[PDB]
């Protein structure tokens, strides 16, 4: 599993239980192609309270469900605009994209 990034990351945290009701949602937009799912889970669990991350099939869009608003905001502040494994990322609130 590759981790090549230009940002300092927190350690991996445990995911919230899969059935946890969703509190915050993020769009992840990949330029030029999406990243593998295991990489995405490793990266996005690091902010805590990650319920799930998945890709929209065959598209450059992923979706991050968090059990905590502050955690998702941390993921935005840390990852938006950064490069991961050769891919540029946009991370934004799903309900109000920038």
Residue numbers in the entry: 369 to 466
The authors write:
RBM45 is an RNA-binding protein with roles in neural development by regulating RNA splicing. RBM45 consists of three RNA-recognition motif (RRM) domains, two at the N-terminus (RRM1 and RRM2) and one at the C-terminus (RRM3), and a pseudo-RRM domain in the middle.
To determine the structure of the C-terminal RRM (RRM3) of RBM45, we tried a series of different RBM45 fragments containing RRM3 for crystallization, and finally obtained crystals of a fragment from residue 370 to the C-terminus (hereafter named RBM45RRM3) and resolved its crystal structure at 2.4-Å resolution. The last nine residues at the C-terminus, including the NLS, are disordered in all four molecules. The four β-strands form an antiparallel β–sheet in the order of β4–β1–β3–β2, while the two α-helices are located on the same side of the sheet. The overall structure of RBM45RRM3 can be well aligned with the AlphaFold-predicted model with a Cα root-mean-square deviation (RMSD) of 0.42 Å (for 86 residues). The most significant difference is that RRM3 has a distinctive N-terminal loop surrounding α1 and touching α2 as well as the α2–β4 loop.
